[PDB]
């Protein structure tokens, strides 16, 4: 083994905690999440952990609601069971330094974008005309 070099996604690596969430309930409604799930998922305050190992990116989310973990290679689709229990087909790419996560299921699609803004990691969840913004800071 030799030690690898860095990459642009290193800006994302680390441990992040949710500090603010706007219009997430409306997002979840638009996605089709049911009442009891929305209310408990909307109350969650996740720690999000992003790591890189070679070509593989891992995103872990930990909360009192659910713990999730996905591992992927940019541009390479995978199967994902989401925290709300949708079975989706997911592809995650970089677009100009934004991590773009598209989920497809049941003829529907939603996009989750992650972007660095100052010391924060901003998450933008989009379902048709409904957007939710979630802001994370370093743990
Ligand atoms: C319909 C919802 C429950 C799916 C969902 C949206 C956003 C996240 C992460 C990015 C988050 O910020 O918690 C996780 C799950």
Q: Please report the atom of ligand 1 found closest to the CA of residue 68.
A: 14
Question: Residue 128, SS3?
Answer: coil
DSSP result, 14-83: EEEEEEEEESHHHHHHHHT--HHHHHHHHH---EEEEEEETTEEEEEEE-SS-EEEEEEETT--EEEE-T
Alpha helices in the chain (DSSP H): 24-31, 35-43
- Would you say 125 and 135 are in contact if contact means Cβ atoms under 8 Å apart? no
Domains of the chain, first to last: 1-139 (2.40.128.20)
Write out residues with Cβ below 6 Å of ligand 1: 28, 31, 33, 41, 46, 61, 82-84, 112, 123, 125, 134
Binding-site residue set for a fatty acid? 134-136
Of 122, 120, 119, 103, the residue nearest 111 (C-alpha):
103
Between the two ends of the chain, the Cα-to-Cα distance in Å is: 31
What are 127's strand-pairing partners?
A: 130
Helices (H) and strands (E) in the chain, counts: 2, 10
Write down how long the chain is: 139
Of 39, 52, 46, the residue nearest 13 (C-alpha):
52
Q: What six digits make up the tokens of 39? A: 């209310």
């Amino acid at each position: 083994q030799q030690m690898g070099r860095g990459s642009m996604c290193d800006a994302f690596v680390g441990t992040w905690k949710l500090v603010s969430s706007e219009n997430f309930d409306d997002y979840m409604k638009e996605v089709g999440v049911g009442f009891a799930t929305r209310k408990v998922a909307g109350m969650a305050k996740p720690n999000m952990i992003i790591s890189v190992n070679g070509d593989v990116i891992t995103i872990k989310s930990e909360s009192t609601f659910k713990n999730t973990e996905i591992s992927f290679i940019l541009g390479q689709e995978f199967d994902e069971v989401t925290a709300d229990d949708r079975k989706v087909k997911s592809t995650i790419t970089l677009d100009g330094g934004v991590l773009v996560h598209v989920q497809k299921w049941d003829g529907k699609s939603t996009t989750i974008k992650r972007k660095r803004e100052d010391d924060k990691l901003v998450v933008e969840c989009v379902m048709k005309g409904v957007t939710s913004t979630r802001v994370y800071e370093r743990a």
